[PDB]
């Protein structure tokens, strides 16, 4: 499913100024916007060409919203230090993620609104968009407040409404990239690895979206246990890269095949050395 997600990070830095707030937004695996409270004149800024075309009222309003959330998070960090009786000397992190996944009917499939403090879950909106999960006593304080304020009903309306509406708009305006997979460019390399063994490495480069599967089989059998697989990584131009490698006895290379599955391939590819 297509998805829109915002990732917000607020970090206190006592003795080094006020907390820094950074936010990025994505459609699927494409970033489209950033905001950084430490920038010279902090603004929501485009990072994809399909939102650069949104007009000046759009960017003014997004800027406004970011600035108000940054302010509120400086307060949030203070509050959290108090809830946990933390020292004023320590640095702390509050992270928030919210957004929506788009269903086949063009409506909300799943919405998200959740948070972590110092790397661990704090409070999250439940999948029913009606109720909250608080991880500890401090978070239960926020929960009770938010229950009494009907915060979940407000979030529900945003997630079902605006969030999906904007996602759909972005997907249409960006369709040539967001709705069109770029297939992986694939090849195999061979690296003699001792006097009698060799590494075969199956490469997938230049692909979008990031989801991919690379597997080595020997005699048609998955070598799951003996395959080194790196984590899929960004190329830096909006595409991704991955490889999988296996160490084989020299001369047995022909029994090995690399299998590539990706949404941009109509049938899985097989490569061989």
């Amino acid at each position: 499913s297509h998805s829109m997600r915002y990732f917000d990070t607020a970090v206190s830095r006592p003795g080094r100024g006020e907390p820094r707030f950074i936010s990025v937004g994505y459609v699927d695996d494409t970033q489209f916007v950033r905001f950084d409270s430490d920038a010279a004149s902090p603004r929501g800024e485009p990072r994809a060409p399909w939102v650069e075309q949104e007009g000046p009222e759009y960017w003014d309003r997004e800027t406004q919203k970011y600035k108000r959330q940054a302010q509120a998070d400086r307060v949030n960090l203070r509050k959290l230090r108090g809830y946990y009786n933390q020292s004023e000397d320590g640095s702390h992190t509050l992270q928030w993620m919210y957004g929506c996944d788009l269903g086949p009917d063009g409506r909300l499939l799943r919405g998200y609104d959740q948070s972590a403090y110092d790397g661990k879950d704090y409070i999250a909106l439940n999948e029913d968009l009606r109720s909250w999960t608080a991880a500890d006593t401090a978070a239960q304080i926020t929960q009770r407040k938010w229950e009494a304020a009907r915060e979940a009903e407000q979030w529900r309306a945003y997630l079902e409404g605006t969030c999906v509406e904007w996602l759909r708009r972005y997907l249409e305006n960006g369709k040539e990239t967001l709705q069109r997979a770029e297939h992986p460019k694939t090849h195999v390399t061979h690296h003699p690895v001792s006097d009698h063994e060799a590494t075969l490495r199956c490469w997938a480069l230049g692909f979008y979206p990031a989801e991919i599967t690379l597997t080595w089989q020997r005699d048609g059998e998955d070598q799951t246990q003996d395959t080194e697989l790196v984590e899929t990584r960004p190329a830096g131009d909006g595409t991704f890269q991955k490889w999988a490698a296996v160490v084989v006895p020299s001369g047995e290379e022909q029994r090995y095949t690399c299998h590539v599955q990706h949404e941009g391939l109509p049938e899985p590819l097989t490569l061989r050395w």
Binding site: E62, K65, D73, K145, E151, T162
Partner: peptide, 9 residues
């Protein structure tokens, strides 16, 4: 686009 709903803990 961002929500208008600001988190206040």
């Amino acid at each position: 686009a961002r929500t208008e709903l600001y988190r206040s803990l």
